[PDB]
Structure formats: structure tokens, C-alpha cells
Write a protein that binds this ligand. Structure first.
Ligand code: NA
Ligand code: NA
Ligand code: NA
Lengths: 139, 139, 139
């Protein structure tokens, strides 16, 4: 059985950002040499996400607005997690909505994706070095 | 290592629908011949879901009402994704709540499920041909 | 190919509870003897979750408050699922937010986790025996 592992690192300019990581995953799959298998890609931090959706700026804006509605950043005081000086309680909630991980089929050496599937890193508490894990198993 | 792949296609009569796909997955598992492994089942479209929950009509109604509360279809104008004539922004949000995928253990040639687990395709922007992927790896 | 399976059982004192199960998963991984692979851990019941986040009491409180906002338990009458005497409709919704499952990479005989990742059983309709499945495949 083959396995492959890679950490992808991010340090976003702002607190929140969506980053299309599809091409990075494509290169992981390619270098793994795995023909058939499963790929896991997950945020290694509990204030960020890996998810699949559209790469369209309007929709990215809509996710920002929606996540702020469902899990508002402010006031910081509304969250007990922030009681001793942290301010990232909302990021733990936002990541929960978008999800921690994707699992993607590898078929004939490629990610087995639909026409509009793109993989994103969803940063909700950035401006510091954070990590995504790619793990592939198969043959 | 064995692997198995199947696309399951749907064309729903209405915009939104839940479809119990458990029996289809059972037939995938059976024909794969895999005894022990992991099964991924995911929506290949970014406006639909695969999830596990109850097959009970009251609950299906409750999910419809709840998803409309969390991610209302209308007005279309509230979403920037819809600015150039699409109207499916809400479906990208609804699918995010329900999830893209399930991963299910295969044990002794069967899906390793609890007593009430049923697998659903959650269509949020239907009336067109859309796809679910089943991928199984193991031995 | 190696595979490993274990059911972990819970019977919570109260309706809702978060339980850190990370050490149990560590022991599964250890006893499996698997060096490289993927671990699935999922709630086998459709009113509970397995998820990864912080083990911090303030945040646990915040999740409780947030989930009650997004998917209120009461009044029971607001949910059609509860129409014939059940009262757990909200638990099916809450679990949907937190998620059914985690998938975790196994690397060099260990769960491949970031610095603050902890795995939780999220019980939303407890006080009865319920189950989590751990399944590991790899070599
Ligand atoms: Na935090
Ligand atoms: Na769209
Ligand atoms: Na129920």
C-alpha cells in the first residue's frame, strides 16, 4: 500500500480569507504516484476549514456575510472562550459550519471531481502560520 | 488493494428533494467484493449534499424549514453570487450545512451502520442531471 | 492491508454533553499496529456527533449556546419529527451542524494532529446507550 503526506502552510494577510488550494492538491496527487485511493485534506488548526465549493467572488462574499450572521465575530464578550483575552471564539464556530476536512476519491491518478468542485482553505483566524494536512492512501 | 467506483445520477422533479440512497450504496458495496475498507460517498456538485440521518417524513420537513431559516432561497438579490442571473446561491449554503460527503466503514462486506443510519442525497438545486460519487477502497 | 474496528459506547448523565475521546482513539491506533493509514470515527446514532475542536470549557459553553440558537430544543411542537411523542428533533439538527464524523490521518503509528486538535463525542440526545465507531485502514 502506498501512502503520501504533505503539510501545506498558510499565513494570511487578514483575519479571514478563502484560498483556492486545488492546484496544490493536484501536485500532491501527482507526486504520490497513487493511481486509486482516497485523499484527506484537513485544517490542522481548530479555527480554520478545508471545504469544496465554487471559485466565484460573489459567492465568497456571500459566505463571508452568511458566516458573520451565523457566528458573529463581535462583540468578543459574547463568547466565554474569549474571557481571558483570546478573540477567536467565532472562528471555531465558523470553521464548524464550513467543515474541517474533505475526503476526495483518487481515480486513474487524479482527484475524481465534478465540474465545479474546487478545494479551499478557509481561514477564520489568520495572520499567523497555520497548516493543512494532505494524506493519501491507496495503490 | 481493491478499489471500486460508481457514479449515481439524479434528476429531481423539483428544486429541493431528499432521496434515500442507502440501497444503492448497499449494492455498490456488494458488487465491489470488498470485505474491509472505507466507502466515500459525495455530491459531485457544489449545490447538493450527501448526509446520513433519519428516513422519517416529519424530520425531512423539519430540515426543509430549518435550512430555509439558515440559508433562505429568496430574495435572490441578497446574494452576490446571483448577480449575473443565477439563482442558486442559497443551495451552496444549504449544502454546506448538510455536508458534502459521508465516509462509512465497510466491515465483513457491509456498511457498518447504526440502527437508524440512512444515507441521503440532498438536492438543493435540482431539475437537472447531477451526480454522486461512490468510492470504496480496501480488501 | 490491515484494518481495525472498535465501537466506543457512551451513556451520558444528561441530554447534552461533550466528551473528549482523544485518548481512546490513541489506544485504538496503538493497538491496531497500523503505521500509515486513515482513521474514521463517527457517531453511529443520528442525534450525536464526532468532531474536532478545543478542549476548553468556555468554548464548550459557547457551542451549547450557539447550537441552541441555531437549532433550539424547544418548543418541541415546532418540529414535525416530534409529532408522535419523540422530543429529539433538535438533536438531529444540532448533530448536523457539528458533523457526523472525523477522518484523521495515521502517520508513523500516530494520529497526525495539529497542536490543539482534540476529538469529541457530541451527545445531543443522551441518557441512553449510544455508540461511536472507529475504523482504521492502512499498513
Ligand atoms: Na481559540
Ligand atoms: Na452556483
Ligand atoms: Na429522532
Amino acid at each position: 500500500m502506498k501512502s503520501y503526506r504533505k503539510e501545506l502552510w498558510f499565513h494570511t494577510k487578514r483575519r479571514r480569507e478563502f484560498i483556492n488550494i486545488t492546484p496544490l492538491l493536484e501536485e500532491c496527487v501527482r507526486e504520490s504516484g497513487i493511481k486509486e485511493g482516497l485523499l484527506l485534506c484537513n485544517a490542522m488548526h481548530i479555527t480554520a476549514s478545508v471545504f469544496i465549493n465554487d471559485d466565484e467572488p460573489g459567492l465568497h462574499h456571500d459566505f463571508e456575510v452568511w458566516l458573520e450572521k451565523l457566528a458573529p465575530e463581535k462583540p468578543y464578550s459574547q463568547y466565554k472562550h474569549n474571557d481571558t483575552g483570546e478573540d477567536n471564539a467565532d472562528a471555531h464556530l465558523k470553521r464548524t459550519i464550513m467543515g474541517r476536512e474533505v475526503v476526495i476519491a483518487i481515480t486513474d491518478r487524479k482527484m475524481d471531481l465534478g465540474p465545479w468542485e474546487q478545494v479551499f482553505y478557509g481561514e477564520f483566524d489568520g495572520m499567523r502560520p497555520k497548516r493543512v494536512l494532505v494524506k493519501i492512501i491507496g495503490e
